[PDB]
Structure 1
Amino acid sequence: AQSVPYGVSQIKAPALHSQGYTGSNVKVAVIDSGIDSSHPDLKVAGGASMVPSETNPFQDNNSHGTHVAGTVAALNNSIGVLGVAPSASLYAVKVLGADGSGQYSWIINGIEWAIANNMDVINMSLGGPSGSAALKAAVDKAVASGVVVVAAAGNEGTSGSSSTVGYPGKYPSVIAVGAVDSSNQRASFSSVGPELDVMAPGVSIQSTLPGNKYGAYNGTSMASPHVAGAAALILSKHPNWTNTQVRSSLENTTTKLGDSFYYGKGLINVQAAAQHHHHHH
């Protein structure tokens, strides 16, 4: 039997599924450590590796990209978990090696590949404390080209009045996602700042792991693909909506939580986002 992880229910993805919308024909690039394409609860449609010493994007030597992919798009069947957008066309864009790290140029090359290959959504469950001009230009180019770009806010917690959101989440063109638990409480590690845009579940999130396994991970890395998967659901119901419109639909229909410094606009609600008329619940 398949299980629906709590976070998929919490963002109201089953309401889209019951309307008949599951992300079909939407192309989502998981820009990350690879995706294990042999997992029976994932279908990987394509991809490319930008990591010089790990040339196979369908081999995930870390596990992180596989877990993130399962939250976006684990298949709807009688096994494992159910993804937010279980019919999405999933692309493994490997820019991180086994140790979880990548050079800025590798991430940028992955973003460029996504643009050249007409991806509809990019998820980046990754970041660092400093930006670069070339990084900002790559994310700005993807957004100018029509791509919805979603990233983890970072796990830097609080630091008085200072923002702790990492890059590329911290750029205005990217939707930065923080983490809440099943009670809608912000996770203590979740980054904060005026750049925090929305929140999604990021505590004890069950998903796919390499070698046909499953497990619970924590992080804004886990929250980001709820929002990337939500963007795919929205585009499957409204295939002509632009990235501008998908982004506003998610922002304008959150359930507001606390102060925006800590919670942004609140928890995403993809049922409300995918209606024509938007308001907060």
Structure 2
Amino acid sequence: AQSVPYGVSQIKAPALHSQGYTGSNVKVAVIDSGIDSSHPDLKVAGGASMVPSETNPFQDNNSHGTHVAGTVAALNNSIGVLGVAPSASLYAVKVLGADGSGQYSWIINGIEWAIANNMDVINMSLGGPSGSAALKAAVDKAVASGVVVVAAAGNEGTSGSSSTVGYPGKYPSVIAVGAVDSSNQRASFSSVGPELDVMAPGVSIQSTLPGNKYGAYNGTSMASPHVAGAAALILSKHPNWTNTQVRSSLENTTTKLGDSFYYGKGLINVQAAAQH
């Protein structure tokens, strides 16, 4: 049987599926460790690998990418799970190796490929503690070109009054996403700071895993694809809206939670964002 993971209903994606809005024709690049394209509960439309020794983006030797991609777009059928945007066209943009790490130039090259191939949404479930001129340039150009760009805030918890949001989430051009649980409580690991934009479910999230498996994971990596998927739903109902409009509709319709330093504007609500 097919199960709907709790995070997909918490953001209210089912209300949009009920009017026929499921992401059809919206192109989502998952910039990550690749995606297992032979998964029975996934359809991958294209891709490229930037990782010099792992040239197949359709083989995911880590498991991370495939799990992120199932949150965005696991197929609506009679098996496994269901994505936020289950008719989305998923692109595998492999920038991380089997150990889940990559060089900054591989990440940049991934973003560049996403611009060149006209992606509508980019999801980045990844980060580092330092930025760079080339990385800042590349995300600001994706946004200038029209792309909605979403990234994990980071898993560094609190450190007083200091911000713990990593890059590229820390850039103003990027929607930085933190993690809540099924009770709308911030997860202990979730990064904080003025750069934090919104929250989405990040605790015990079931999704697809390589080799026809399913599995629950935690992290701001799992919260980010909820928002990338939400963007794709909004664009399938309003294909005429810009990235500016999509971002502002999500930020203005959240369920408000705590202090913005810990919760950004609050938990996304895609049903409300899509009625704006």
Per-residue deviation, 1:221: 0.1
Displacement of 1:222 in angstroms is 0.1
Unaligned ranges ≥5, structure 2 = none
**1:7 Cα deviation from its structure 2 partner:** 0.1
Q: Structure 2-normalised TM-score?
A: 1.00
C-alpha distance in 1 between matches for 2:138 and 2:37: 27
Residues in 2 aligned to 1:125 and 1:15: alpha-carbon distance in whole angstroms: 26
Distance between the aligned counterparts of 2:164 and 2:16, measured in 1? 33
Pair 1:5 & 2:2 matched: no
Q: CA deviation at 1:218?
A: 0.2
% identical aligned pairs: 100
Measured after TM superposition, the shift of residue 19 of structure 1 is 1.2
When the two structures are superposed, what TM-score results if normalisation uses the length of structure 1?
0.98
- Cα separation, 2, equivalents of 1:166 and 1:15: 33
What's the counterpart of residue 215 of structure 2? 215
Q: After superposition, what is the alpha-carbon deviation per residue over 1:55-86, rounded to whole angstroms, capped at 9, x for unaligned?
A: 00000000000000000000000000000000
3-state SS of 2:271 partner: helix
Superimposed CA distance per residue, residues 144-172 of structure 1 (whole angstroms, 9 cap, x where no aligned partner): 00000000000000000000000000000
1:195 offset after TM fit, Å?
Answer: 0.4
Give CA deviations for 1:190-244 in whole Å, capped at 9, x if unaligned.
0000000000000000000000000000000000000000000000000010000
1:45 — aligned with what?
A: 45
Which residue of the partner structure matches residue 189 of structure 1?
189
- SS at 2:221's partner residue? helix
- List structure 1 runs of 4+ shifted beyond 4 angstroms: none
Give the Cα separation in 2 of the matches to 1:47 and 1:7: 27
Q: Give aligned pairs, total.
A: 276
CA–CA distance in structure 1, aligned partners of residues 77 and 233 of structure 2: 18
Secondary structure of the structure 2 residue equivalent to 1:21: coil
Per the TM alignment, residue 9 of structure 1 is displaced from its structure 2 partner at its CA by: 0.2
Q: CA deviation at 1:18?
A: 0.5
The two structures, once aligned, show a CA RMSD in angstroms of 0.8
Q: Which runs of 5+ in 1 are unaligned?
A: 276-280
Alignment partners' CA distance in 1, 2:195 and 2:141: 19
Give the drift of 1:8.
0.0
1:258-279 CA deviation, whole Å, 9 max, x = no partner? Answer: 000000000000000001xxxx
Instruction: Return the alpha-carbon distance in structure 1 between the equivalents of residues 242 and 77 of structure 2.
Output: 30
Q: CA deviation at 1:143?
A: 0.2
